[PDB]
Amino acid sequence: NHNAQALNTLVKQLSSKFGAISSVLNDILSRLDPPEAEVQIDRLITGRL
Amino acid sequence: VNLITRTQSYTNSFTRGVYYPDKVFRSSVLHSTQDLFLPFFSNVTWFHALPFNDGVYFASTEKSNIIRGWIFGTTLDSKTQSLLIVNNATNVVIKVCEFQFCNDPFLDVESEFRVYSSANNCTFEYVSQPFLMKNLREFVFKNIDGYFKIYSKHTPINLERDLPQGFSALEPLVDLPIGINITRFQTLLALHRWTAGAAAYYVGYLQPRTFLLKYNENGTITDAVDCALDPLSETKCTLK
Amino acid sequence: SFTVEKGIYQTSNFRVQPTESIVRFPNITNLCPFHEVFNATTFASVYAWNRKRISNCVADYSVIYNFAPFFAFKCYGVSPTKLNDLCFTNVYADSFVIRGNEVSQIAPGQTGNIADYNYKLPDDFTGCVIAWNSNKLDSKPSGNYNYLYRLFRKSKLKPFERDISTEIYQAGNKPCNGVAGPNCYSPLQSYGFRPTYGVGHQPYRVVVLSFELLHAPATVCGPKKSTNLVKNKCVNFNFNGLTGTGVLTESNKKFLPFQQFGRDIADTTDAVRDPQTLEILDITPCSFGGVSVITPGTN
Amino acid sequence: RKRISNCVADYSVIYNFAPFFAFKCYGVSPTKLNDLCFTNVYADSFVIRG
Numbered sequence: 167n168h169n170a171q172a173l174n175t176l177v178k179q180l181s182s183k184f185g186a187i188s189s190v191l192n193d194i195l196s197r198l199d200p201p202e203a204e205v206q207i208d209r210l211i212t213g214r215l
Numbered sequence: 216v217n218l219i220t221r222t223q224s225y226t227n228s229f230t231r232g233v234y235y236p237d238k239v240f241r242s243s244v245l246h247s248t249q250d251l252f253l254p255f256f257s258n259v260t261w262f263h264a265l266p267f268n269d270g271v272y273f274a275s276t277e278k279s280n281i282i283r284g285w286i287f288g289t290t291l292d293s294k295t296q297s298l299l300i301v302n303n304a305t306n307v308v309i310k311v312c313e314f315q316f317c318n319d320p321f322l323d324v325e326s327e328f329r330v331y332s333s334a335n336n337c338t339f340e341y342v343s344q345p346f347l348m349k350n351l352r353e354f355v356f357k358n359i360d361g362y363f364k365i366y367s368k369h370t371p372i373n374l375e376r377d378l379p380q381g382f383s384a385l386e387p388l389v390d391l392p393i394g395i396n397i398t399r400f401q402t403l404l405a406l407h408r409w410t411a412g413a414a415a416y417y418v419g420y421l422q423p424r425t426f427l428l429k430y431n432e433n434g435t436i437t438d439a440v441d442c443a444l445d446p447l448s449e450t451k452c453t454l455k
Numbered sequence: 456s457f458t459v460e461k462g463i464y465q466t467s468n469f470r471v472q473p474t475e476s477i478v479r480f481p482n483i484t485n486l487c488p489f490h491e492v493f494n495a496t497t498f499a500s501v502y503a504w505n506r507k508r509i510s511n512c513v514a515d516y517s518v519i520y521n522f523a524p525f526f527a528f529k530c531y532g533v534s535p536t537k538l539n540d541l542c543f544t545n546v547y548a549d550s551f552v553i554r555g556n557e558v559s560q561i562a563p564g565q566t567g568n569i570a571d572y573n574y575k576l577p578d579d580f581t582g583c584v585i586a587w588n589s590n591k592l593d594s595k596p597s598g599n600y601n602y603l604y605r606l607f608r609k610s611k612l613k614p615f616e617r618d619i620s621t622e623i624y625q626a627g628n629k630p631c632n633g634v635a636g637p638n639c640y641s642p643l644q645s646y647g648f649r650p651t652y653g654v655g656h657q658p659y660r661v662v663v664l665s666f667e668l669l670h671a672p673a674t675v676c677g678p679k680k681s682t683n684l685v686k687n688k689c690v691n692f693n694f695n696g697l698t699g700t701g702v703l704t705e706s707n708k709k710f711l712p713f714q715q716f717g718r719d720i721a722d723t724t725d726a727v728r729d730p731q732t733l734e735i736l737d738i739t740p741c742s743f744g745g746v747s748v749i750t751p752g753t754n
Numbered sequence: 755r756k757r758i759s760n761c762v763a764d765y766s767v768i769y770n771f772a773p774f775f776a777f778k779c780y781g782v783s784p785t786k787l788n789d790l791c792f793t794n795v796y797a798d799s800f801v802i803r804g
């Protein structure tokens with residue numbers, strides 16, 4: 167039970183926004199431009215860390 | 216032209232008024248949704264210029280086809296736009312025109328002069344196959360961020376006086392980008408022409424609540440839990 | 456290290472690359488009425504700003520580039536370069552005429568008389584603003600007073616709010632009762648445009664495009680033609696703006712006639728509906744894993 | 755430079771004085787000013803090019 171619960175929580179955490187425009191990297195890579203996407207990508211990287 | 220008699224009563228909603236929140240398929244899962252719903256075991260009005268508030272649950276059980284059409288507006292005058300829905304034996308027509316409505320609008324049967332004086336300036340018009348097809352018909356109307364949403368369901372019922380006990384999910388029917396305010400609404404009847412008649416229907420109101428929905432293996436909702444009815448429901452929602 | 460002991464070591468990972476790309480789109484053919492909203496020879500005032508809704512058409516931006524060498528072109532939600540491939544549900548178009556010096560006043564988080572009394576944008580705005588000079592169309596030699604601007608309002612306006620009230624603003628409790636003068640002034644002033652006027656005062660046609668994301672299945676996009684369909688192969692797919700990669704197989708799921716997507720316990724996409732031909736397809740991720748190296752000692 | 759203190763601070767005169775061309779508040783928003791409390795206020799006045 168504990169192993170399954172921990173894995174489920176870890177995989178569920180991937181859908182959070184952490185104060186970004188979107189929780190999908192492809193959406194940001196298809197909508198925005200290189201020199202501005204970093205501000206959004208940093209929050210996702212941190213939260214997943 | 217006034218031929219309407221309305222008597223009010225009150226009854227229990229039980230567990231009616233559950234609809235699919237969105238168009239995403241799910242199966243064999245339990246989901247949690249925060250949206251406008253009709254609370255379980257509610258005080259619903261029975262009727263033999265009602266406010267709109269924040270959504271309306273409407274129910275009827277008459278097979279006479281005496282019920283047809285609806286009017287939605289803010290001031291119910293020709294100075295402001297008003298949704299008008301008409302259903303007849305062939306099609307359904309939706310208009311957003313600023314009609315000069317009357318005190319008791321109803322179908323003459325089929326002149327609409329008693330309904331309104333004349334049509335006026337307007338842009339949106341919709342024509343589709345009719346909504347209407349021992350039986351119970353349930354509808355849910357809401358209006359959020361410029362979109363008017365309608366859900367409907369038709370079920371076969373046995374001989375009963377009040378609403379039956381059970382679950383029947385309501386499926387989306389249409390969605391219109393109107394973007395106007397609605398504060399009051401009215402119901403249209405079709406009396407032959409001037410024989411007096413009577414009709415009954417149930418009305419309830421929606422509130423923002425959190426629900427727990429259960430999907431079966433084929434993707435249909437078969438059970439729901441209101442997360443604020445009583446402590447046992449709170450425990451169920453916490454434990455998922 | 457230059458020496459390795461006996462054992463098994465975990466080095467790097469491996470995965471399988473997609474073979475090709477798959478693009479799908481509906482069979483619509485009607486072109487969007489972007490031409491009509493422009494070059495109409497008639498533009499509304501700033502306080503009474505026109506609103507139009509565009510949907511259910513093929514959105515092509517070539518007319519935007521060939522229409523005029525725009526003086527101002529600022530996109531906020533997305534970059535202007537990647538606009539010919541995105542998909543949207545509804546588009547909102549606003550057009551009006553403003554003074555050349557007020558163009559920068561129209562942006563989210565900005566002030567100005569247009570901003571607070573005429574028209575303001577939400578902080579989370581997602582769209583573009585286009586402005587081109589119109590000195591040779593709406594600048595009479597004697598002057599044109601058709602366009603007016605508000606100057607006084609009790610408070611700040613709201614995002615996406617249109618004001619059409621025409622009342623004499625009262626600067627206090629001094630009664631005026633419809634007259635103009637003491638503590639009672641008309642807040643609307645007419646533009647003055649002449650060809651002799653230089654840059655900074657000549658009229659400018661301004662059009663604001665506003666998009667909305669993730670509200671319904673996409674309806675306005677598709678300038679790129681669709682391709683064929685393949686199965687049982689690692690491939691990229693783009694279903695009406697939904698982009699992904701993996702393997703597509705036949706599905707036995709019983710989709711309801713109004714839902715299109717599919718999800719699982721972990722909230723991931725595991726099914727899709729082909730737009731052109733109504734069919735259900737299961738999506739599975741392509742193979743990936745770790746690579747281990749088994750070695751005896753280098754000695 | 756002037757110092758204002760020990761008085762009832764009413765901002766009605768601010769609104770009725772003139773339709774100000776520029777009104778920019780940084781530390782706090784201009785809307786919530788009739789309820790705050792302060793120790794001393796410093797007022798500076800001058801004339802500048804537009």
Ligand SMILES: *[C@@H]1O[C@H](CO)[C@@H](O)[C@H](O)[C@H]1NC(C)=O
Pocket residue numbers: 225226258
């Ligand atoms: C429902 O409303 C009526 C009148 O509004 C009230 O008398 C009654 O107590 C309420 N509750 C029930 C359970 O009927």
Ligand SMILES: *[C@@H]1O[C@H](CO)[C@@H](O)[C@H](O)[C@H]1NC(C)=O
Pocket residue numbers: 303304305306308
């Ligand atoms: C129902 O209303 C539509 C819309 O006016 C009309 O075209 C149609 O003929 C009507 N049906 C009948 C049976 O009159």
Ligand SMILES: *[C@@H]1O[C@H](CO)[C@@H](O)[C@H](O)[C@H]1NC(C)=O
Pocket residue numbers: 335336337
């Ligand atoms: C309808 O609205 C338009 C647009 O403002 C207006 O010109 C017209 O006078 C209104 N009334 C009618 C009957 O068209």
Ligand SMILES: *[C@@H]1O[C@H](CO)[C@@H](O)[C@H](O)[C@H]1NC(C)=O
Pocket residue numbers: 289395396397398
């Ligand atoms: C709609 O009508 C109501 C009631 O008259 C009013 O309060 C509101 O400002 C109007 N407009 C909108 C957008 O709700």
Ligand SMILES: *[C@@H]1O[C@H](CO)[C@@H](O)[C@H](O)[C@H]1NC(C)=O
Pocket residue numbers: 431432433709
């Ligand atoms: C689901 O569908 C299958 C076949 O489509 C059927 O055998 C089964 O009874 C259904 N389950 C329900 C309706 O709960």
Ligand SMILES: *[C@@H]1O[C@H](CO)[C@@H](O)[C@H](O)[C@H]1NC(C)=O
Pocket residue numbers: 493494495496522
């Ligand atoms: C737009 O209209 C003007 C005159 O109304 C015309 O000269 C022009 O060719 C039209 N098309 C474009 C793309 O400007």
